[PDB]
Structures are given as structure tokens and as C-alpha cells.
Amino acid sequence: SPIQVIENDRASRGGQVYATNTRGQIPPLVTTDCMIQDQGNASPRFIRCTTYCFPCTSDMAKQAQIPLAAVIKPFATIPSNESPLYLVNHGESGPVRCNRCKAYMCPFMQFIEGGRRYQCGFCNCVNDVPPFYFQHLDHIGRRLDHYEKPELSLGSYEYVATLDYCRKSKPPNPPAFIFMIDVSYSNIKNGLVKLICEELKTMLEKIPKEEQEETSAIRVGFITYNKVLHFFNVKSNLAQPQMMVVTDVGEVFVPLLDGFLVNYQESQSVIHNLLDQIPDMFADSNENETVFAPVIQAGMEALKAADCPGKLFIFHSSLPTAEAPGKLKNRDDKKLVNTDKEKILFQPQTNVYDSLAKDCVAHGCSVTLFLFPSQYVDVASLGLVPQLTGGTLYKYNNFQMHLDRQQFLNDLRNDIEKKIGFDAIMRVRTSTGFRATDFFGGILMNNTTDVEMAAIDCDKAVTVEFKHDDKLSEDSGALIQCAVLYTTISGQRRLRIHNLGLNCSSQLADLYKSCETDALINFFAKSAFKAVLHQPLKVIREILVNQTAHMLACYRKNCASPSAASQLILPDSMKVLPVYMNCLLKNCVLLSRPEISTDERAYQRQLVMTMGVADSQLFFYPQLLPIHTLDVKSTMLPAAVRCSESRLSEEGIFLLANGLHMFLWLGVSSPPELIQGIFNVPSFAHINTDMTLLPEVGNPYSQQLRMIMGIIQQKRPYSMKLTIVKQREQPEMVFRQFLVEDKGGSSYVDFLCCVHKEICQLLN
């Protein structure tokens, strides 16, 4: 079971300090909370790997078929007790770099010849150190100030970027938040429009600002639309906002400069005067058709006029059908199993959404779409721009005010206050022996080499794949340096560097000893999810199973102690690799037509692509907590239980959450005592599933259940949609879709015996 592993690693490593001083050290599991101190290598909160010990020969990599990858969360939220990142400045010369591989100054560069010159680990080239940075030595190859300067002893730090890194070699401008609202009949009726306006007044105050300044430099603009764009002039001196309506959709243009993007604190009374009227303005609107791509095309051109990056907060209702560039038809069609062209269902209908996405990223424009579907919406097409741009997609199926209100406002407060950078580019440099060849995440690329992110937050993550090049060296090992150049919310060019060393090995045993199952799944999930747009689903599913079997067959065949021909020998690191793999193969994204909406398939496919390992572990193996057993006035953590219907009692109550939904399950024999202390109603048959809002009445349990619900939501970016479920013949048919160790694909004992039948096919 996965539970037995998680607790076994929580016991040996939890509550202890993990110091990253060893070269090829193996960090704990994501589930295991432990204090981290940055010595040498970067923290696993920033970057984890599939294997912390690479093979040395490319032929050996083909033998084990173990993927060499890493999951980088470059702006992960460092805890309050862990030491923060240090900012480094190398003056006018800019950060010191190698003259061959262009790698930045890091602890991996040994100083020699009296500190006069240094040799790069990545290429081994030697650079005469700039004199200002020179003149420091130690008895044994240690800069005297080696400890003082963070770029010489830490693995995570930030550089100050000179002007030759910026666009047009000129200092950048602060970004801008452009809020754009759909105002068709769909959102006027369900009361969403006035909600956005009323609650925007509150959270415009909370737009991020730095400690060094006293007021956020982020300016703010406003637009509404329904097949026709409505611009707003909210300059500081106006007592009344001006509206400029554009109908030339197709050759869209921005009709205004200086009546747009004004500092919120300056035009406060003017913006609030607008936010009170927009609800009243479109109340009697009967328009139902709307545009979409011209809205993004407009917000992009507005950011180019002010010559600054920005983030588009788009709120949309239903499918865009109005005649315009980006018009979406209803293209859902019987085309998935062995279709060989099912990949079209996961791709944008028109060819322009890719070109619009390219234009946005080039000008540092990000879009975060808040989608409120009530019918088919084509997530594959709408979400392509807010995914290629590094934004987020918030989808709320069949929005109802008395229910999903709190869920949406919690996600809007979250995406505004996110520590976000802009106009970012990533570049993963490696030592002589390998290079980065493929990339996964919300990103766009032109050069094989560079990853471009219009905006990146603390929750995004990129998964990088490595392929062997020439031969690795057992003495040096394998080195990784990730560099993210970007722009701050105060408009300052800044680099962030992550350095991670790993050790090579000529022995196949050390390969499997140093595997993280949580990270292996993150790569495999994204890997399949990207090939969905190219190859049939049954083809990809064969690739996943065969590679998993070939991995557990090479450990068995090549170096495993001789065991019986009825046993499956798996190492400690890959104890749960088959279970997790079988859960990824049961996710709806790789499944058939019946009972699964394509938009939910496209929605889940986008969500995983941006996942950090920590998240990927929860979305695929949910957490199941039994509540009835929990004893009041007890330590808060209740141990998780295996994910199956078997570990449930009719009597029992459980909590399930994968990071996006949260289910409160109730057995038919659930004790009426707990039901009264939580649901305020006497019996089990007195609960209404449709009234799934936060209940507050209670003193021992309704405070206890609400306490454990809060700690679960804590480390999770998306605020989970609560779904209360009764046992017999209720909408639990959806609840069983997350009990991933249940059949519903093959089972666990079958997949094990499946791995073993190809364990013996690779005769050895």
C-alpha cells in the first residue's frame, strides 16, 4: 500500500532537518513535512528528480529505461522558518558567467591558481575571474569569502540583471492588471456580474506590493464585452468614467491611452464609480452570443501600448459563438477509442489560438481565465491561451450562487495576491554529459533551448527531461543549473538560480536505489498528457505499461538476487510505482467516452500539466481520512487510509480530497450523534446533498472536522469544491471515480502479475 510507505518515511525523516550538503543526496518524500536548510544543493521544495543518480553510459539508460527528469518549481513558497533567498549584485559587469556554456556563478566552480582562475563544472572551461571579484583564497580551494557570499555556498539565490538582459536594453516598466468581464445574459442572470464588481472593490486594495515601496506600481484597466468590446476611461481627474465601444471586431484595436491602466490608489473614487454602474449597465441585456479571442487580442494590444507586461483576468460564461476570429462551433463528435484522430478533440478548433498565444508571450502578456460553463464550452480551445501563457484556468461547472459563491471568491483572492513575475524565460544548463531535450508545463517555446513564460507564480512548475550525451563521469557526476530571468512587480529585471548536483554510477543497483516514485509519476502523467495531442490513447497506454514493466524487469533480471518465478521483486523506492501507475491509467483523461465530458477531460489535462510534484501525488492518489473514529481533543492529524471502497463502513464517515474536489462521505448506518454535531439535523435522512455549503453549528466535532478540512486546504492552491455524499444509490457514482485502487482498467494484483510476465520475457 502507499499509506504504509508514506508513514514509514514520515517516521524516519519527519520532524528532522535535511541538509543538502551531499552531492547526490536523496531528499524525503513530498508527503513528509520536515525542516530544510540550504547547504550546497537546492531545496527539494524547488526541484525534485526522478532519479538522484544518473547512469553513466547512454547504453545503460536504454537498458533500465528509467526516465531522467526533474520537476522544477522555481518560485516555490519557502516556509517562514526556512532561510529566505539572498539577492546578489555583481555591479555593472552583470553576473559572472562562464564564457563557453554561459553558466552563472555557483558553488560548482572550483577556484584554482590562487583564485586567479576558475574551472566550470559544466564544461570544465576556465575563466579568468574578473579582478573585482578576485583576490580571495583558502587553504584548500575555498574562497575566503566563500561562506559570506551566497552565490558561492548556497544553491538557491537571485541575481541582479543588468540592462543587456532586458527588452531593447532598457529598464522595464511595472506590469498591469486588466480585468475583462463577460456581460452576456448568461452571467447577468446567475448574478455573477455584480458579484465580480462588488468584490473587486475589496480586493483591489490587496494587489501585491513590495516592502521597499509604499504602494503597488501595478496599474489597472477594465473592459467588458458581449460580441462587442467595451473599454473604460478611468483617469484620475474624471468624476465620471467614460466608455468607448469598439465594434470593429476582427481588426481589433485599443481606442484609448491614459484613460486606461491607472494606479488604483490615484483613481480610487473613479473606479468605484464605475464598479457600481456596470451591474446596472447591462441588466436588461438580452445578448447571448459572445466573442473570446478578440478580448485577449485587445488586452494584449493594451499592454503593448503602455509598453509593459501584464496579466489578463478574464471572466467568461459559455461557448463563444459570435461571428469573429476565434468563433467556436460545437465540435464534440464520436471520435476517441482507436480513432487515430481523437487528438483533434484536445486541440484548438481554429489555428489562430496558437498564433494569439505566440503574440501574447512575445509581449509578456498572461491570461488567467475564470470559466463558468453551463453547457459544452470547448476547454481544449478556450484554455489554450491561458495555458501556453503560464496562467491558470478556473472552471466552475453549472455555477449556482447559493453554492459555489465562496469557492470562486476564494480563488479570485488567491490569483490576485499570488507572488507573480512577468516576461520570464527559463534555461536549464547541464554539465558535459547530457542536456535538456523536452519540457512540460505551462510554457511556450521557439528555441529548443529556451522556455518562455509570460507569467509564473509560486504554484506553477515545469518538468524537464534529460537525454544522455557522450558519457558521464563517476568522479564529477551530473550537474544541473536552472536560471529564470524575469521582471518583478516593481519593474526590476532579476534572475533566479537553482543549482543541483547529482552523482553518476556505473552500477545498475544504485539507479533503482535513488528513485522517487512521486516524481516518476509526475513526468509520466505529463508525458502521456502531451502525447495525447499526437498519438492514439491506446498507443500511449501501451507505452506507459511497457516502460513500467521494462523498468521492473531490468531490476529483476540484471542485478536482483535470484528469486522464484512466481514472485515480483521490487526495490524500496519503487514499492508503489505499480499502484500509482495503475491510478494514472484510470484517470478519465486516458479513458473512454461513456460518462466523461470532453471538457472535463480537457480541464483535467491542463491542470496536471502545471503541477508540482507535491500536487501530482495528491491528484492521482487522493487522501482518505476516517472521521468517526477520530477522537476529540486529540492531535489533529488522523492517519490516512488506503484508497478503496473496502476500507469503509456503512457506519463510518470519511473525507476524500485530491486537491480540487473534497467529498464528505456518509454511510447508511452513520451515527446520528455525529450527524447532529455537524449537520445540525437529527438523522441521516435529514441531510440535503444539494445544500453543500459550509456548516458552522457545533462545538466538539463541527469544529474538529472543520479544523482538519482547513489544514488539508492549506498547502493547496485551488480551493476545493465540497461535495457531500450519502451511501446507497446517491450521486456517489462520481465519488467512486476517485477511489483509484478500485477497478471501476485492470486491478493491482493483475498489473503486478502483468509486470512479472514481461519480467520473464526479458530472460535473465
Partner 1 sequence: TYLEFIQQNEERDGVRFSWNVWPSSRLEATRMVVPVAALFTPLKERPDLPPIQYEPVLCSRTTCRAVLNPLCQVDYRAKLWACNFCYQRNQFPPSYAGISELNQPAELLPQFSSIEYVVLRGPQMPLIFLYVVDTCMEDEDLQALKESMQMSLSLLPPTALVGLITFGRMVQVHELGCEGISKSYVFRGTKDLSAKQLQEMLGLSKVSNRFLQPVQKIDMNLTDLLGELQRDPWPVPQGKRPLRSSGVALSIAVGLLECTFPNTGARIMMFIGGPATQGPGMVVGDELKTPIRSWHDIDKDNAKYVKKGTKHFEALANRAATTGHVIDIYACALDQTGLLEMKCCPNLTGGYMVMGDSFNTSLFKQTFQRVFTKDMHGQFKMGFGGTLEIKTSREIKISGAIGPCVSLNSKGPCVSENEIGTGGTCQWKICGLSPTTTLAIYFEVVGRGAIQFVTQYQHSSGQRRIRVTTIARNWADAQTQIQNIAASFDQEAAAILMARLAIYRAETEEGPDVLRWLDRQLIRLCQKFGEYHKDDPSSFRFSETFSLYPQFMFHLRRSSFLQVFNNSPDESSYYRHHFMRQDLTQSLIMIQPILYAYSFSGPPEPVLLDSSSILADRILLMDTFFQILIYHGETIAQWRKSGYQDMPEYENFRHLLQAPVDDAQEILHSRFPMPRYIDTEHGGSQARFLLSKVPILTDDVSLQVFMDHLKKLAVS
Is 536 one of the binding residues for partner 1 (CB under 8 A)? no
Candidate residues 8, 119, 162, 242; the one interacting with partner 1 per rule CB under 8 A = 242
**Binding segment for Zn ion among 118-126, 301-309, 388-396, 726-734 (CB under 5 A)?**
118-126
Is 125 one of the binding residues for Zn ion (CB under 5 A)? yes
With CB under 5 A, what is the number of residues at the site for Zn ion? 7
Is 323 one of the binding residues for partner 1 (CB under 8 A)? no
b/e burial code for range 35-50 (CB count within 10 A of at least 16 → b): ebebebbbbbbbbbbb
CA dist., res. 717 & res. 2, Å (int)? 24
Q: How crowded is residue 31: how many other Cβ atoms within 10 Å of its Cβ?
A: 19
CA dist., res. 634 & res. 637, Å (int)? 9
Is 650 one of the binding residues for partner 1 (CB under 8 A)? no
First to last CA, the chain: 28
Least spacing, CB of residue 216 vs partner 1, in Å: 26
Angstrom distances, CA of residue 542 to CA of 78, 521, 538, 547: 39, 16, 6, 8
Least spacing, CB of residue 286 vs partner 1, in Å: 12
**CA geometry: angle 265, 267, 269, nearest 5 deg:** 100
Is 214 one of the binding residues for partner 1 (CB under 8 A)? no
**Binding segment for Zn ion among 117-125, 451-459, 616-624, 661-669 (CB under 5 A)?**
117-125
CA dist., res. 740 & res. 459, Å (int)? 25
Is 538 one of the binding residues for Zn ion (CB under 5 A)? no
Q: Which of Zn ion, partner 1, none interacts with 122 (beta carbon under 5 to 8 A by kind)?
A: Zn ion
Scan for cell 473496502, then name that residue: 646
Return phi, psi of residue 372, to 5°.
Answer: -125, 65
Is 307 one of the binding residues for partner 1 (CB under 8 A)? no
Candidate residues 217, 244, 352, 708; the one interacting with partner 1 per rule CB under 8 A = 244
By C-beta, is 129 or 234 nearer to partner 1?
A: 234
Q: Which of partner 1, Zn ion, none interacts with 241 (beta carbon under 5 to 8 A by kind)?
A: partner 1
**Annotated binding site for Zn(2+), which residues?**
98, 101, 120, 123
Q: Which of Zn ion, partner 1, none interacts with 101 (beta carbon under 5 to 8 A by kind)?
A: Zn ion
**Binding segment for partner 1 among 60-68, 151-159, 250-258, 462-470 (CB under 8 A)?**
250-258
Candidate residues 11, 87, 245, 639; the one interacting with partner 1 per rule CB under 8 A = 245
Is 253 one of the binding residues for partner 1 (CB under 8 A)? yes
Q: What is the 3-state secondary structure (H, E, C) of 502-546?
A: EEEECCHHHHHHCECHHHHHHHHHHHHHHHCCCCCHHHHHHHHHH
CA dist., res. 504 & res. 477, Å (int)? 5
Q: Which of Zn ion, partner 1, none interacts with 621 (beta carbon under 5 to 8 A by kind)?
A: none
Is 120 one of the binding residues for Zn ion (CB under 5 A)? yes
Q: Is 124 left (phi over 0), alpha (psi -120 to 50) or beta?
A: left
Candidate residues 128, 210, 258, 332; the one interacting with partner 1 per rule CB under 8 A = 258
Is 117 one of the binding residues for Zn ion (CB under 5 A)? no
CA dist., res. 689 & res. 655, Å (int)? 15
**Binding segment for partner 1 among 244-252, 333-341, 372-380, 467-475 (CB under 8 A)?**
244-252
**Is 447 exposed, middle or buried (CB count within 10 Å of its CB: 0-12, 13-18, 19+)?**
exposed
By C-beta, is 45 or 90 nearer to Zn ion?
A: 90
CA 341 to chain centre: 28
Is 243 one of the binding residues for partner 1 (CB under 8 A)? yes
Q: Which residues contact 714 (CB under 8 A, 6 or more apart)?
A: none
Q: Which three cell numbers stand for residue 678?
A: 455537524
Return phi, psi of residue 50, to 5°.
Answer: -65, -50
By C-beta, is 240 or 375 nearer to partner 1?
A: 240
Is 248 one of the binding residues for partner 1 (CB under 8 A)? yes
Is 98 one of the binding residues for Zn ion (CB under 5 A)? yes
By C-beta, is 251 or 729 nearer to partner 1?
A: 251
By C-beta, is 196 or 256 nearer to partner 1?
A: 256
By C-beta, is 255 or 695 nearer to partner 1?
A: 255
By C-beta, is 100 or 201 nearer to Zn ion?
A: 100
DSSP-assigned letters across all residues of 254-305: ---SSSSSEETTTTHHHHHHHHTHHHHHTTT--------HHHHHHHHHHHHH
Candidate residues 164, 211, 214, 251; the one interacting with partner 1 per rule CB under 8 A = 251
DSSP 3-state of 630: coil
Any bridge partners for residue 315, and if so which? 181, 370
With CB under 8 A, what is the number of residues at the site for partner 1? 18
Is 213 one of the binding residues for partner 1 (CB under 8 A)? no
Q: Which of partner 1, Zn ion, none interacts with 214 (beta carbon under 5 to 8 A by kind)?
A: none
Is 101 one of the binding residues for Zn ion (CB under 5 A)? yes
**Binding segment for Zn ion among 77-85, 120-128, 235-243, 447-455 (CB under 5 A)?**
120-128
Scan for cell 498565444, then name that residue: 357
DSSP 3-state of 645: helix
Is 181 one of the binding residues for partner 1 (CB under 8 A)? no
Candidate residues 122, 619, 679, 751; the one interacting with Zn ion per rule CB under 5 A = 122
Is 241 one of the binding residues for partner 1 (CB under 8 A)? yes
Residue 512 CB-half CA count within 13 A = 24
Return phi, psi of residue 500, to 5°.
Answer: -140, 125
Q: Which three cell numbers stand for residue 434?
A: 547530457
Is 123 one of the binding residues for Zn ion (CB under 5 A)? yes
Q: Which of Zn ion, partner 1, none interacts with 100 (beta carbon under 5 to 8 A by kind)?
A: Zn ion
Q: Which of partner 1, Zn ion, none interacts with 120 (beta carbon under 5 to 8 A by kind)?
A: Zn ion
**Annotated binding site, which residues?**
98, 101, 120, 123
Angstrom distances, CA of residue 372 to CA of 187, 329, 348, 357, 590: 8, 18, 19, 22, 24
Q: Which of Zn ion, partner 1, none interacts with 255 (beta carbon under 5 to 8 A by kind)?
A: partner 1
By C-beta, is 279 or 491 nearer to partner 1?
A: 279
Is 247 one of the binding residues for partner 1 (CB under 8 A)? yes
Q: Which of partner 1, Zn ion, none interacts with 123 (beta carbon under 5 to 8 A by kind)?
A: Zn ion
Is 424 one of the binding residues for Zn ion (CB under 5 A)? no
By C-beta, is 124 or 277 nearer to Zn ion?
A: 124
Candidate residues 265, 277, 644, 746; the one interacting with partner 1 per rule CB under 8 A = 277
b/e burial code for range 102-121 (CB count within 10 A of at least 16 → b): ebbbbbbbebeeebeebbbb
CA dist., res. 390 & res. 279, Å (int)? 30
DSSP 3-state of 51: strand
DSSP-assigned letters across all residues of 30-97: TTS---EE-SBSPPTTTEEESBSEEESBHHHHHHH---EEEEE-TT----SSS--PPEE--GGG-S-B
Is 685 one of the binding residues for partner 1 (CB under 8 A)? no
By C-beta, is 119 or 747 nearer to Zn ion?
A: 119
DSSP 382: H
Least spacing, CB of residue 68 vs partner 1, in Å: 53
DSSP 3-state of 666: strand
Angstrom distances, CA of residue 294 to CA of 219, 385, 390, 532: 22, 12, 19, 28
Least spacing, CB of residue 281 vs partner 1, in Å: 8
424, 483 contact by CB (below 8 A)? no
Candidate residues 19, 163, 203, 257; the one interacting with partner 1 per rule CB under 8 A = 257
Angstrom distances, CA of residue 295 to CA of 254, 275, 312, 352: 11, 19, 10, 13
Q: Which of partner 1, Zn ion, none interacts with 46 (beta carbon under 5 to 8 A by kind)?
A: none
DSSP 3-state of 678: helix
Scan for cell 476565434, then name that residue: 326
Q: How crowded is residue 760: how many other Cβ atoms within 10 Å of its Cβ?
A: 12
Is 246 one of the binding residues for partner 1 (CB under 8 A)? yes
Site of interaction with partner 1 (CB under 8 A)? 230-231, 240-248, 251, 253, 255, 257-258, 277, 281
Instruction: Report the interface residues with Zn ion, using CB under 5 A.
Output: 98, 100-101, 120, 122-123, 125
